């Protein structure tokens with residue numbers, strides 16, 4: 667502190683001093699131990715309906731970059747899986763590393779990926795986002811791992827606009843982007859009850875983490891690392907390593923949709 671971030675002086679190990687819930691019973695991310703996750707045949711396939719998605723803007727908030735969607739109606743929703751009810755997409759963002767061997771927040775059998783995409787949705791029964799985050803089933807986040815390999819064509823539009831939102835507080839119009847181009851071929855997943863992974867750390871999230879990673883090229887992820895944490899005209903601090911490490915599982919079970 668001063669304000670939280672990912673540095674040595676205000677990084678995740680310090681958050682508990684302003685947000686005591688950091689040492690809570692249902693904090694995220696976690697390590698997914700594949701041999702201890704329970705297959706649960708009662709879980710339903712996920713239903714991702716993003717064909718009427720309306721993206722609006724892309725913003726650098728100082729901790730990541732969010733692409734925001736119009737959520738005033740049921741245009742891009744997730745339902746099914748372990749969820750009851752309809753959850754509307756409000757924004758996506760990424761977490762990534764300064765090197766390719768780190769960057770994801772969840773890990774799989776202790777394996778870290780180069781980055782992790784979060785598609786954040788909120789439960790329509792609560793009427794708005796801000797009321798959703800106060801309830802134990804208020805949000806559902808789909809997490810997708812990224813590995814370095816082949817380029818992902820559907821991520822290129824995002825990569826290309828980054829130069830225009832280089833520093834904190836910058837935004838740019840970002841319409842007609844289709845988030846379908848960011849899904850792996852398979853929707854197999856793990857699920858557990860957890861929290862937002864940045865302050866205020868609220869325990870209101872059902873996480874849905876996809877088993878299959880997407881590939882991005884080295885050049886693509888290289889462009890993420892050119893962003894800045896600082897605002898314009900402040901000393902440059904590249905936006906890298908904006909990931910929280912794995913927290914204790916405590917009394918929770920990870921369930922798998924697959925065997």
Ligand SMILES: [Hg+2]
Pocket residue numbers: 759760761784863
């Ligand atoms: Hg996130």
Ligand SMILES: [Hg+2]
Pocket residue numbers: 798799800801802804868869870871
């Ligand atoms: Hg909550």
